Structure 1
Amino acid sequence: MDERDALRISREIAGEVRKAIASMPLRERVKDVGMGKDGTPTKAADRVAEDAALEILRKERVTVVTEESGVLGEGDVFVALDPLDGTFNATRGIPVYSVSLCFSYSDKLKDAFFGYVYNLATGDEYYADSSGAYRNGERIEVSDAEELYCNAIIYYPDRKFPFKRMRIFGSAATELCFFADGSFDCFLDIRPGKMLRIYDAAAGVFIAEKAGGKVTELDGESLGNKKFDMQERLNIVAANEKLHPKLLELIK
């Protein structure tokens, strides 16, 4: 498979998922319908999203690792799929939620070759391949902020910080893209419990890196060895080259 295919497949999937979610009233969306292989509940919105996505994906030589249904398939290409990220927002009609896809030649993020995050409420399309990072077809790049006094997306603040702004939107996949296009200066998930899962962050990280960002684990450790499995968890410190180590110092 190549990044050209990944784009088509992803775009095809975005269409069906967007269509499914939009046609579903909020009353329905918010209903708990099952237990997810990930160990959290599967809302109805999660379900109709995943089933739409899977039906397109199965047809490929991939191993899908997805939030509600767990690990599916045998293919040598691994696909980290959050069928619906920001599920909570979508149940309340809050317009920040996305489908997220990260394609990789192995079960490790270091071998990622395509990232896709598509805002299902606005139609904003983020992706990245070897040619760079895009938002609705246009090249993007992170910001050049040098001072800690910046615009931060941070899960979760637990003390007094020096940021200009803090925001928490509820879709890590989308929020990493907000950082990738430079809307925010950094993205931090520093929650002690290590909460982010591979399908939440993979596409977002890849897109953010191609956009020029430095994206690491909690102590600067590279993320290259993170696995496309259900047990994997992540902290993330993401910011441009200059700003990044200043942040690593700050949360120490």
Structure 2
Amino acid sequence: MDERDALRISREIAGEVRKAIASMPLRERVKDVGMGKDGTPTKAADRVAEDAALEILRKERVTVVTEESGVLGEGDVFVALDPLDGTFNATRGIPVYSVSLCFSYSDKLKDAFFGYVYNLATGDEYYADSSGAYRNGERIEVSDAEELYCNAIIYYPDRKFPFKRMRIFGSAATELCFFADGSFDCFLDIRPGKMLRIYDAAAGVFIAEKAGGKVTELDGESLGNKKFDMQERLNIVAANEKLHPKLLELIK
């Protein structure tokens, strides 16, 4: 499998997940249907999205790490799948939620070769590969802001901060893409509980880095050894390389 295969696979999944969600009334979407392998409820919207995606991934030689069904398959290519990132928004009709996929040549983030996040409500397509990062077929890059007085996505502000704007949209994969395309100047997840899982973050991280972003853990450490499994957790500090160290100092 190469990056072209991954793009093709991702686009087919996006199409099937989009069709499955769009036809589901909010009343149905919001229903709990079971307990996910991640230890949070699987909503009916989560279930239909994952089935749509797994139906396609099942044909490939991959090991899938996915929120609801856990680790599936035995292939050498690892796929971190979030079949519906932003479930709360989807069940409320708030148009920020997406399907997220990151493909790696091992079970570690450093061997990632493809990232894909598709907004299921708007049809916006973000992806990145060896040639760079894209939004709807157009090359993107992070902003060049150097000041802390900037436009920040942050989970969660717990003190007075110097930002120009703070936003929290409820879809980490999509929000990492808002940072990747320069819509926002930085993305932070500094929750002490360390809540982000590998499938929430992996594609967004890969896309943001291809777009020029510097993206690390809380203390500046590389995310390269983050594992494609259900147990992995992440804090994220993401910004261009001039802003990034200021962000690190800010949160000490």
TM norm. shorter chain > 0.5: yes
Percent of aligned positions that are identical: 100
What is the distance in 1 between the residues matched to 2:79 and 2:144? 31
Q: Aligned-pair distance for 1:93?
A: 0.3
TM-score, normalised to structure 2, is: 1.00
What is the distance in 1 between the residues matched to 2:146 and 2:12? 39
SS in 2 for 1:21: helix
Structure 1 runs of 4+ with >6 Å offset? none
What is the distance in 1 between the residues matched to 2:92 and 2:175? 18
Q: Aligned-pair distance for 1:207?
A: 0.1
2:154 maps to what in 1? Answer: 154
Q: Aligned-pair distance for 1:121?
A: 0.2
TM-score, normalised to structure 1, is: 1.00
Q: Number of residues paired by the alignment?
A: 252
Question: Unmatched 5+ residue regions in structure 2?
Answer: none
Q: Deviations over 1:174-218 (max 9, x none)?
A: 000000000000000000000000000000000000000000000
Q: Deviations over 1:32-61 (max 9, x none)?
A: 000000000000000000000000001000
SS in 2 for 1:45: helix
Question: Unmatched 5+ residue regions in structure 1?
Answer: none
SS in 2 for 1:107: coil
What is the distance in 1 between the residues matched to 2:129 and 2:201? 16
Q: Deviations over 1:219-241 (max 9, x none)?
A: 00000000000000000000001
1:96 maps to what in 2? Answer: 96
Q: Deviations over 1:141-185 (max 9, x none)?
A: 000001100000000000000000000000000000000000000
What is the distance in 1 between the residues matched to 2:148 and 2:52? 42
Q: Deviations over 1:83-131 (max 9, x none)?
A: 0000000000000000000000000000000000000000000000000
What is the distance in 1 between the residues matched to 2:101 and 2:174? 12
Q: CA RMSD in A?
A: 0.2
What is the distance in 2 between the residues matched to 1:22 and 1:37? 25
